[model samples]
Target: GMWQFPLFETILIEQGQAKNISYHQQRYEKSLLKFYPKMKLQPFDLAKIIAKHTALFTHREGLIRCRIDYNHHDYVLQCFPYQQKVYRTFKPVFCDHIDYSLKFSDRTLLNNLLKQKEECDEIMIIRQGKVTDCSIGNLIFRQNNQWITPDKPLLEGTQRAKLLEQKKIIAREIFFEDLAQYEEIRLINAMNGL
Candidate 1:
């Protein structure tokens, strides 16, 4: 059943450096508590793992995407060159069936919901009339000069956590009708910025 249930984390490696690692570690710890409380999981040194993998590509630079998938005990690390998606403005489509409480490797439900985006760049998921998150990451809406993210997203992303701690974004209940109050929206994940 290990293969059937995989928890994972995606890290953004920029210029051979992994960003927001502590936030990732915190989230992973929380996920373990939620999904495998009975199991005494050992701490994983992601910094060391990431260093070893990034050293393999010292000759190269830019952005590298690192994905770590794990079960209750075992885990695997994979790294690949990555590029950020360029979206000046996102075209949002509504989806209500998506639910990603854990950072599971299985993205079947998310993929299905993304298909409903039609010609849009990303899907804005709505759960019970409240905006949860975008298919790819946590959603942040800019109202006036302040930025606010959804109080409850499909998943609490590492980048989102960091921003919240930094007081760069506030968490609040954003309803579908409330979208009109915001002037702009941004999709943020481990790979994406504020």
Candidate 2:
């Protein structure tokens, strides 16, 4: 039951118009999401599961690789456990979890988490001393009693999208190495209630 597929299309938008239209320079636009139906699956406590699986199957490093693939069609959200409690106003779902989880199994997020495996209950996405995102989820940092998020997070997670629609948080770009600036940080995902 490991085989799955997703069908969809992604489109790219360009700015400005061309005076002269050419064959190749006709402001070509292509949809990246092309009829791929992606299915999502999140096992209980994905972080622990990945940690166990990777430890047994791949390597012995403290950090584990957690992600959903297009071929697998499984969208397991939320990995890694957090020690400190981040408050939420409502119930959280499973698929929408975005606590600092890596985007597409790349080294950027993974290495960041791995670097501070000891100090990081969760390797957070910080920029200029402000909390942006977490190692496994998106972050909502409160400044002057206002909540905001970073646009350049690993991604705009499912729950994060809903919150955006709800007008609960504002989206902005945040750099790395900033966390203490905010008064508090909240974690979001499909499973956890915010």
Candidate 3:
């Protein structure tokens, strides 16, 4: 069915408003250009769709997770009540072969890597001796009070883009061994902040 080949975006909704929609749109357009160059994708109004669906939430005041999936022929939108994940500490695991340049619906590779997080709260994916990303979000390291993110991420996260555009974070090459140079590491994504 729709799962045959899918591109999806996970957006955060707060008080019935979709967050970072323009970034999502940009990613969507870019993915379409890269993967389905010949197909003409119809314009989607994320804000309107979000408002219509989020109105069904039992509690309308808090956070919600909106997942929009699309393929060459069609698209679907789904929403779920969301709660922020809390991690006391993140443990790192080395994965050199992991590649997730696109936000495809299938996450088998990432899921397999997550299997290695046996003792850690989450999996930190390292590619070719450099920090790439976590299973769920972009990785940011704080060194000397400055927050730096990896120039190469598994997937270019909307939150990471927003933060970079705002100059809240700097992009740099973070080597796997260089983790020791940083005092703290945080995971940032469309849903959570560092």
What TM-score, over all chains together, does every model reach? 0.90, 0.44, 0.90
- Give the per-residue lDDT digits (tens) of candidate 2, residues 1-194: 12342211111111212111121111111111222225333223322433344333333233322233332333332334223355432221112333333234433534544356453455554444444555556777777867778776654465566677678887876544444466766777543326
Which lDDT tens digits does candidate 3 get at residues 37-105?
877777676566766763645464889888889876567887777888875466677777766887888
Error of 2 at 54 (Å): 31
Candidate 1: clashing pairs of residues: none
RMSD of 3: 2.1
The ten-residue window of minimal lDDT in model 3 covers: 51-60
Model 1 lDDT per residue over 1-194, tens place: 14754888898887656889888888878888888988888868777777776474575468888888876666788777787785435555566666589887777777777888767778788887888877778889998799999998889889999999999999999888998999987888998987
- lDDT for each candidate structure: 0.81, 0.42, 0.81
